[PDB]
Design a protein around this ligand. Structure first.
Ligand SMILES: Nc1ncnc2c1ncn2[C@@H]1O[C@H](COP(=O)(O)OP(=O)(O)O)[C@@H](O)[C@H]1O
Ligand SMILES: Nc1ncnc2c1ncn2[C@@H]1O[C@H](COP(=O)(O)OP(=O)(O)O)[C@@H](O)[C@H]1O
Ligand SMILES: Nc1ncnc2c1ncn2[C@@H]1O[C@H](COP(=O)(O)OP(=O)(O)O)[C@@H](O)[C@H]1O
Ligand SMILES: [Mg+2]
Ligand SMILES: [Mg+2]
Ligand SMILES: [Mg+2]
Ligand SMILES: [Mg+2]
Lengths: 48, 532, 205, 52, 528, 260
């Protein structure tokens, strides 16, 4: 459920993780790792 | 009676409060000292995260209230600015000096005597360091630089990869080397453009043999690769000409309006034609470029980059031999662009780095420069790599400028403590206690290293002190001055043989700054805090 | 019952310590009331039109930024509100959002603020609660949407009760266009970062 | 700071006699350059004797 | 940390562990010791503490100051507990124990902060304390002569040393002689309740007196009391527990009569019961009548007619003291008032002391009790005089238990420090540093004495160390001469028990504090 | 707090007072001629007694530093496009005029720079101007081309001190700018304070003026301020010795003698 009202159906790791807001900085680091993997090669986002 | 609108603290209370604040600052960063130290994660109540090990960065990000603590924070900042290394050791030493001085004061020793003793002890420590413990790097070679960089890069995110990172650091520093008047080789760090980009492993970090720009070509029409680049650096924008504030256009005959409007862009057209007629291939400007000028560059098969940073443009011009032209005005009142104002480079390529593009200028002529592209796992890792890399570059610059280094691992400070506790008996009657307390406070760093390593700090420091005492007493054991700490095995080790070095300037400046800060805080015996 | 010319005389100078101690708290309050009335009482107690460009604006807003969406900053206390309004350069516009959780139309405008902040780095979008500011009951009951504007420390917009002119299911483009109707909104992607003494370089000399 | 004039003028004293002493220390700083603490101590001692 | 949807402990539970927790504990102990630091020595200063009700307590006793302080720090309360323990066991040294314990903790703080295992520190403290106690027992000076004169002098000197830190230090000889005389008349149990301490406002300290007998305040005299003679020259005292009043015979008693003759007979019978009790008391031969239960106006007038003295509602403890002094027996029944149940005193007299009337029982050769009548100018003045006299009394009692004394003024601590340093110089080195720290910590007492006296502590400590190293067991701080002197020949004597208990309690407190590593504070219940 | 550094500071203060006044026929000392400059960084041991002057302003002409045998010139006019005191506008009614305006502005700026250079000047100080641009980029480029170091944003109230120190005379119009108004100096260089900023030092002046400058260093700001106050106290003591040349013992002797 997008904060602006949108709906996202996906099983992509980066697509799911980019929509989660977290407070623990370790979770922020993990999300940044997911985004790095998605931008660098575009695949293997859940695997990393 | 006083009727002062504020709170007043006098006597032992204010001194204890000041020492409490200094100890709090020291304990904030005490856990990030030495190779067995660990980083810290800082959150700024908005979401931004800063994973760091540098003491100066940690103390700068924190918001501090007590003035005595702010003194230590600015002390760390000054140590970073003037040296670049040891920003944690200086804070720890200053806090320990303050604590021991407060203990002496509580023992009814007048603070003036303590301050005099501290000054004498600092002077003698500097003299002993410069006389005995220094090692001349002339007989060592490039291995000394490699070892110094590796030592500086320990306790950092790039500590394990030092075998390659130190080589990169030394190569960059040697590349940016220049000489000045009086024949003094000066190494201008901060001329190494550090670029960060997440992606591949740290082993894929690139040392560019040239310069790296964080900019792309202005339009997709222009080629992204020029072989024999003729760089033209400009300090002025290339836009449609707009007349100054003091000039206005008033039309009484309509027939001149079209001519005026046409010349309004023909001026920039002529300037671009003058620039391109000399064979320039790459054009870098600090100002902006609009669509028509971009098209002009496209049709000529050139390469135009807009909004180039002034410092980057200056570095590129210096490296390539180009001269930055603020305007196309010569001494004859005309508009000319000579070919002598063109830099030369072996290649200019717009490479792709993790779904983003940056411009690489390779193998500049008439001068060799360097740039480092750091590849990490995310933004925080890249930032920490950049900080550690800057520390290593500063350390290598210090080693190359001043050709003396001292053994690391606490050997220098153990030797200093032994020598100072021996020398205290020969100076004064009450300042000797201050000298002895200075010597004892100097042992806080090896103690902190041993504690961080989870080793027996008391026994290890006792063994180190015994080794250094035997070295200073026995005239035939001058080779034992290098015995320091091996944090991995938790045993004393000859660090000069092991290759644990650091610049003498680091210890000298840290000692002087810590002594001055402790003396400054020690003078305060009354605090008046006016209400806002 | 005499002595109207009291002439307290020595009394004050021996007690001005406590008087100024009370006056400091009084002034700390007084700045708060002075700043919290600038929207109260005055308005608180009281086929080219199809806009086909707004759709593509919405889609390009959906792809705004890569790193993160980020959240609108929340003010925790009146003193924090005071010292972030008073601070910061006066050349930048600051707009403050007041809400109470439960009323409709709050999450939509919060998301609009999030999108605009993502696409406007200069802006410093922030939100406050109506309960933490201690406003009047009328504000809490009939003035839930309140978009205050601070450009250099003064209002250039005092939009209150924007539900009628914005609806209840408005999106980011609608709020952006409505704010741009009165000219409130001022007019590349690096790898991660570029920023890294002042000695630059030299040659031979 | 150890300067008497600086200490006196930095803190607000709010008492008329204390304010006159602050002005006195400032005047001593203006004329004699230093000795701004001794003058204040002397004035306080003189008034203390005046009490008895 | 993670939210942990179902948390383990109750919310708000505060847990602190690791080295910082122990360092904070040591700092708290330092703060507590700072509270009573200036109360030690002949140059010590009093402390004033105001409670929530506005009452002010002014005291020099360390235990009293710590009790009035509302210490809530779990580690810091150990110092208050050991001060209470020292007060209970010995009665003196309540300030010394806190200083010694906090100084032990301060000395071992650097080793704690660098990761030393606390068990090693605890073992070092145990060994050092055992050695110090053995040394104190070995070097304490006792003489096997068992003569009254020297024992009396030793008690007087110990009392003077105990008293030479309070506001009554100017009259320390007078009060020391009074205290020793008072203690010498206790028989074998040395019970504190056998030494009454009365405080009467108004009058100098030198006006305070010791009554070789018993004295107590006048107790609500009824009508006709002023006719009773107020001085007797060989009275017999009738100690009674009897309510001499016209009253119902029993609470559940109920009289049923059906004739006016029986009504009159009942009235006369009650009167005859009262007069029979009074007649038995009068025919017992007694001239002074004291009762724990109230004595009515009728009985008071009856005794006034017979030139007798009566005092009802006398406190029970005062009756026990009078029985011990005069030598009678508290009689609940007046039927058998034989000659062996009546107290005998040489002189009984009622005199006015500072606006209050007091009954005096002097001239009791077989008295086994006392009564201090303290004269002062304020309530807190007399309270602190009573506290000082209590300290002196406990010291004299302990000295009576055993005549083993050591020289004070820091001499014993300096000798123990020298001995412990000499011992520690003969061990491998891990325990050597800790025992040396213990020896250095033992130096706090002379240093605190010099700091309180306005001396230069460092020079005096250096001179004391040099002297003790080269010989002289009893060299300590000389306050009057701003120097050091042989305290044994200066008659600064305190029993060895005081220092033994101080060292033991301080070591136990330090070990208990060091052993703790984690502090857990559960959320409060019924916060109201 | 500088009792430890007294061995360095006291001779510095004595020299500062002696070099600013005439040893004979002096009745007072104007301490405003002894400028104190505070620069963060270093230690108190790094304090200096610069004979000339130090300017916190940075060299605008980046690329040229350490001018030797400098002929310093101080101007009070502006190097920009012509602009009269009264309201002025230029009206363009033809493209030829629209080229000629730029051509003539460039020619005017070049003529100004050439007139300045012909005098032999090689270091230029420009007074701060808040009405018109004091140093246009065209003028800066022209000055750099002729190898003249430019230093702009000189404070209006600092003109008198600079003129007293170097010996330059202010020039408010290019007509009167001549070599007779230049101040010769031995060296004019911009030093670097080990990464803690840059100072512009002009040491060595023909016919030195009666001014000295003291540079105060320290680890943090508080000790710098206290060192400045202490140095000022020392200077004031020497001044109070200059007038009323009488000395007494300190150490509590005068007050106890007064009491007796
Ligand atoms: N037909 C298959 N049989 C077995 N494993 C498969 C098959 N297809 C894909 N996989 C596995 O699934 C993984 C891909 O999962 P995916 O949803 O793409 O997550 P990610 O994007 O993180 O790789 C790969 O590691 C691959 O080995
Ligand atoms: N390999 C090593 N072996 C032993 N000691 C080391 C080693 N590397 C660094 N050290 C020591 O650790 C200490 C801490 O350095 P560090 O804290 O990383 O620098 P900074 O103080 O700038 O943060 C240094 O004084 C250094 O002597
Ligand atoms: N006349 C004296 N000269 C030197 N020291 C003394 C004298 N009287 C008492 N002391 C010292 O004072 C210390 C105790 O002081 P005090 O306050 O009386 O009891 P405590 O503090 O133990 O409760 C003892 O250690 C003793 O050595
Ligand atoms: Mg996949
Ligand atoms: Mg380092
Ligand atoms: Mg002075
Ligand atoms: Mg005692």
């Amino acid at each position: 459920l997008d904060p602006m009202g949108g709906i996202v159906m996906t099983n992509d790791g980066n697509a799911i993780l980019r929509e989660i807001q977290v407070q623990h900085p370790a979770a922020k680091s993990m999300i940044e790792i997911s985004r790095t993997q998605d931008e660098e090669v575009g695949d293997g986002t859940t695997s990393v | 009676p006083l009727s002062v609108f504020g709170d007043r603290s006098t006597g032992e209370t204010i001194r204890s409060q000041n020492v409490m604040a200094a100890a709090s600052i020291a304990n904030i960063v005490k856990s990030s000292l030495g190779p067995v130290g660990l980083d810290k994660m800082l959150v700024d109540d908005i979401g931004d995260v800063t994973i760091t090990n540098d003491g100066a960065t940690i103390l700068k990000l924190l918001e501090v209230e007590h003035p005595a603590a702010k003194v230590l924070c600015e002390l760390a900042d000054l140590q970073d600015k003037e040296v670049g290394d040891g920003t944690t050791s200086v804070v720890i030493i200053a806090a320990e000096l303050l604590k021991n001085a407060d203990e002496l004061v509580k023992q009814k020793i007048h603070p003036t005597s303590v301050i005099s003793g501290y000054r004498l002890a600092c002077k003698e420590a500097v003299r002993y360091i410069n006389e005995n413990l220094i090692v001349n790097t002339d007989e060592l070679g490039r291995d000394c630089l490699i070892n110094a960089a590796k030592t500086s890069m320990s306790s950092k995110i790039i500590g394990i990869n030092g075998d390659f990172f130190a080589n990169m650091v030394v190569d960059a520093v040697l590349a940016i080397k220049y000489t000045d008047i009086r024949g003094q080789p000066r190494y201008p760090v901060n001329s190494v453009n550090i670029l960060k980009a997440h992606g591949r492993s740290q082993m894929e970090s690139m040392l560019i043999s040239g310069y790296a720009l964080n900019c792309v070509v202005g339009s997709q029409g222009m080629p992204k690769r020029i072989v024999n680049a003729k760089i033209a650096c400009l300090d002025f924008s290339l836009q449609k000409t707009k007349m100054k504030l003091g000039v206005q256009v008033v039309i009484t005959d309509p027939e001149k309006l079209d001519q005026i409007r046409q010349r309004e862009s023909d001026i920039t057209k002529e300037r671009i034609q003058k620039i391109l007629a000399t064979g320039a291939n790459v054009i870098l400007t600090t100002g902006g470029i609009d669509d028509m000028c971009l098209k002009y560059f496209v049709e000529a098969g050139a390469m135009a980059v807009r909004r180039v940073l002034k410092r980057d443009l200056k570095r590129i011009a210096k490296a390539s031999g180009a001269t930055i032209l603020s305007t196309l005005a010569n001494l004859e009142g005309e508009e000319t662009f000579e070919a002598a104002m063109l830099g030369q480079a072996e290649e200019v390529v717009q490479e792709r780095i993790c779904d983003d593009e940056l411009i690489l200028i390779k193998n500049t002529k008439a001068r060799t420069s360097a740039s480092i592209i750091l590849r990490g796992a995310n933004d925080f890792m890249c930032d920490e790599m950049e900080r550690s890399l800057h520390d290593a570059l500063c350390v290598v610059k210090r080693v190359l400028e001043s050709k003396s280094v001292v053994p690391g691992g606490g050997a220098v400070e153990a030797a200093l403590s032994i020598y100072l506790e021996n020398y205290a008996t020969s100076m004064g009657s009450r300042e000797q206690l201050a000298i002895a307390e200075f010597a004892r406070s100097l042992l806080v760093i090896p103690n902190t290293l041993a504690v961080n390593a989870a080793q027996d700090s008391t026994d290890l420091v006792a063994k180190l002190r015994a080794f250094h005492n035997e070295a200073q007493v026995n005239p035939e054991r001058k080779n034992l001055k290098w015995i320091g700490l091996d944090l991995s095995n938790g045993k004393p080790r000859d660090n000069k043989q092991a290759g644990v070095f650091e610049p003498t300037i680091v210890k000298v400046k840290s000692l002087k700054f810590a002594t001055e800060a402790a003396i400054t805080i020690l003078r305060i015996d009354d605090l008046i805090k006016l209400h806002p | 019952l005499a002595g109207e010319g009291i002439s307290v005389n020595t009394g004050p100078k021996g007690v001005i310590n406590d008087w100024r101690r009370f006056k400091q708290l009084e002034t700390e309050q007084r700045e708060e009331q002075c700043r919290e009335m600038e929207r109260l009482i005055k308005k608180l107690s009281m086929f080219l039109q199809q806009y086909r460009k707004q759709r593509m604006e919405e889609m390009r807003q959906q792809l705004h930024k890569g790193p993160q969406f980020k959240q609108v900053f929340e003010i925790s206390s009146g003193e924090g509100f005071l010292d972030m309004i008073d601070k910061e350069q006066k050349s930048i516009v600051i707009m403050v959002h007041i809400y109470e959780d439960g009323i409709p139309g709050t999450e939509a405008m919060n998301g609009c603020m999030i999108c605009l902040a993502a696409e406007y780095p200069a802006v410093k979008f922030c939100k406050v609660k109506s309960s933490v500011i201690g406003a009047s009951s009328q504000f809490t009951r009939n003035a839930l949407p309140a978009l205050l504007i601070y450009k250099g420390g003064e209002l250039i917009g005092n939009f209150v009760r924007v539900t009628d002119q914005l609806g209840d299911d408005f999106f980011a483009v609608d709020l952006e266009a409505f704010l741009q109707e009165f000219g409130l909104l001022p007019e590349v992607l690096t790898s991660v970062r570029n920023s890294a003494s002042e000695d630059s370089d030299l040659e031979i000399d | 700071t150890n300067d008497g004039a600086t200490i006196l003028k930095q803190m607000q004293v709010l008492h008329p006699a204390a304010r006159m002493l602050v002005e006195l220390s400032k005047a001593q700083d203006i004329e004699a350059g230093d000795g701004t603490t001794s003058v204040v101590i002397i004035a306080g001692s003189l008034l203390d004797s005046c009490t008895k | 940390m993670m939210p942990t949807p179902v948390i383990l402990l109750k919310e708000g539970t505060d847990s602190s562990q690791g080295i910082p927790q122990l360092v904070s504990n040591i700092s708290a102990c330092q703060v507590i010791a700072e509270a009573v630091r200036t109360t030690l020595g002949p140059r010590g200063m009093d402390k004033l503490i105001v409670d929530g009700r506005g009452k002010a307590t002014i005291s020099n006793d360390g235990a009293t100051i710590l009790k009035l302080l509302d210490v809530v720090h779990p580690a810091a309360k150990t110092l208050v507990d050991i001060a209470k323990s020292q007060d209970a066991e010995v009665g003196d040294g309540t300030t010394s124990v806190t200083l010694l314990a906090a100084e032990f903790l301060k000395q071992v703080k650097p080793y704690v902060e660098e990761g030393l295992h606390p068990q090693i520190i605890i073992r070092a403290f145990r060994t050092a304390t055992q050695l110090a106690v053995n040394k104190i027992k070995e070097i304490a000076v006792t003489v096997k002569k068992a003569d009254k004169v020297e024992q009396r002098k030793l008690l007087e000197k110990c009392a003077m040393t105990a008293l030479s830190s309070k506001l009554i230090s100017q009259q320390k000889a007078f009060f020391a002689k009074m205290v020793v005389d008072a203690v010498m008349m206790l028989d074998d149990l040395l019970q504190l309740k056998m030494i009454g301490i009365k405080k009467v406002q108004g009058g100098a300290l030198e006006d305070s007196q010791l009554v070789a007998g018993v004295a107590f305040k006048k107790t609500f005299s009824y009508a006709g009391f002023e006719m009773q003679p107020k001085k007797y020259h060989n009275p017999k005292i009738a100690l009674l527990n009897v309510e001499l009043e016209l009253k119902a015979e029993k609470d559940n008693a109920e009289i049923r009569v059906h004739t006016v003759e029986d009504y009159q007979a009942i009235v006369d019978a009650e009167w005859n019961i009262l007069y029979d009790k009074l007649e038995k008391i009068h025919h017992s031969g007694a001239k002074v009548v004291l009762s724990k239960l109230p004595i009515g106006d009728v009985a008071t007038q009856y005794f006034a007619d017979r030139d007798m003295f009566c005092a009802g509602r006398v406190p029970e403890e005062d009756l026990k003291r009078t029985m011990m002094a005069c030598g009678g027996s508290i009689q609940t029944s007046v039927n058998a008032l034989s000659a062996d149940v009546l107290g005998r005193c040489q002189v009984f007299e009622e005199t006015q002391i500072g606006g209050e009337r007091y009954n005096f029982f002097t001239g009791c050769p077989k008295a086994k009790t006392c009564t201090f009548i303290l004269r002062g100018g304020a309530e807190q003045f007399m309270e602190e005089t009573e506290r000082s006299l209590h300290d002196a009394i406990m010291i004299v009692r302990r000295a009576i238990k055993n005549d083993s004394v050591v020289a004070g003024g820091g001499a014993i601590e300096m000798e123990l420090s020298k001995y412990l340093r000499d011992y520690s110089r003969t061990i491998p080195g891990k325990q050597q540093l800790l025992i040396g720290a213990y020896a250095k910590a033992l130096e706090i007492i002379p240093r605190q004495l010099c700091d309180n006296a306005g001396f230069d502590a460092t020079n005096i400590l250096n001179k004391l160390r040099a002297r003790h190293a080269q010989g002289g067991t009893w060299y300590g701080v000389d306050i009057n001469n701003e120097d050091i002197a042989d305290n044994f020949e200066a008659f600064v004597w305190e029993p060895a028990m005081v220092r033994i208990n101080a060292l033991t309690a301080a070591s136990e407190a330090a070990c208990l504090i060091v052993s703790v590593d984690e502090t857990i504070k559960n959320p409060r219940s019924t916060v109201d | 707090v500088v009792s430890q550094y007294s061995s360095l500071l006291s001779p510095m203060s004595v020299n500062a007072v002696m070099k600013v006044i005439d040893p004979a026929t002096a009745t007072s000392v104007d301490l405003r001629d002894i400028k104190i400059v505070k620069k963060l960084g270093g230690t108190i041991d790094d304090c200096e007694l610069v004979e000339g002057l130090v300017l916190t302003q940075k060299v605008s002409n980046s690329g040229i530093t350490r001018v030797e045998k400098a002929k310093i010139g101080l101007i009070q006019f502006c190097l920009s496009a012509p602009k009269t005191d009264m309201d002025n506008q230029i009206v363009v009614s033809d493209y030829a005029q629209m080229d000629r305006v730029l051509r003539e502005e460039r020619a005017y700026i070049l003529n100004l720079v050439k007139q300045i250079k012909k005098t032999g000047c090689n270091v230029l100080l420009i007074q701060k101007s808040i009405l018109r641009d004091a140093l246009s980029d065209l003028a800066l480029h022209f000055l750099n081309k002729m190898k003249i170091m430019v230093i702009k944003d000189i404070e209006r109230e600092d003109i008198e001190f600079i003129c007293k120190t170097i010996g330059t005379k202010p020039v408010a119009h290019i007509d009167q700018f001549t070599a007779d108004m230049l101040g010769s100096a031995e060296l004019a260089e911009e030093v670097n304070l080990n990464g803690s900023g840059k100072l512009l030092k002009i040491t060595g002046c023909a016919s030195p003026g009666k001014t000295v400058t003291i540079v105060v260093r320290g680890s943090n700001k508080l000790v710098i301020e206290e060192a400045e106050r202490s140095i000022h106290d020392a200077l004031c003591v020497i001044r109070c010795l200059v007038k009323k040349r009488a000395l007494i013992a300190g150490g509590g002797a005068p007050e106890i003698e007064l009491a007796l």
